[PDB]
Design a protein around this ligand. Structure first.
Ligand SMILES: [Cl-]
Ligand SMILES: [Cl-]
Length: 162
């Protein structure tokens, strides 16, 4: 198990534009195209991303390519973030994957409301952090996925995914 397999499980794979849990146009493995309500706008962002006229549909290869970029971007984003980096550097490899998944899902920006949890994670207070993580809109909206990530942070193993 690794970050890629883990997100592939959490996000699924779809080759035609779809709306995500928040109802925003997405494609591939969780690749957000835009928060705009315009499907047109969404097809335009997609062609721009793929570099071709796609007509709202991509191949598997293209989705994996977006996915690789997106994972990479998330990691770099973390390393560039003053509030996130220290946390990430303090974690073991499994837990680091858990932090990546969250960022990937939510954006660094939404990462700010998790300040207290982050501190607990840095202090290695696993159960406390697990409890604090669950009091969040994130948990209330996508409870099954949230449970898997939280378990991952709580145990430091991939059991929730196996
Ligand atoms: Cl892109
Ligand atoms: Cl879920």
């Amino acid at each position: 198990m690794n970050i890629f397999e883990m997100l592939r499980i959490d996000e699924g794979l779809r080759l035609k534009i779809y709306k995500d849990t928040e109802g925003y146009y997405t494609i591939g493995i969780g690749h957000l195209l835009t928060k705009s309500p315009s499907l047109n706008a969404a097809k335009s962002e997609l062609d721009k991303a793929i570099g071709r006229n796609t007509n709202g549909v991509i191949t598997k290869d293209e989705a994996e390519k977006l996915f690789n970029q997106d994972v990479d971007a998330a990691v770099r984003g973390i390393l560039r973030n003053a509030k996130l980096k220290p946390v990430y550097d303090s974690l073991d490899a499994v837990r680091r994957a858990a932090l990546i998944n969250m960022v990937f899902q939510m954006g660094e920006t939404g990462m700010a409301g998790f300040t207290n949890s982050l501190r607990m994670l840095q202090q290695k207070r696993w159960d406390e952090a697990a409890v604090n993580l669950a009091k969040s809109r994130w948990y209330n909206q996508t409870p099954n996925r949230a449970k898997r990530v939280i378990t991952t942070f709580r145990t430091g193993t991939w059991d929730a995914y196996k």
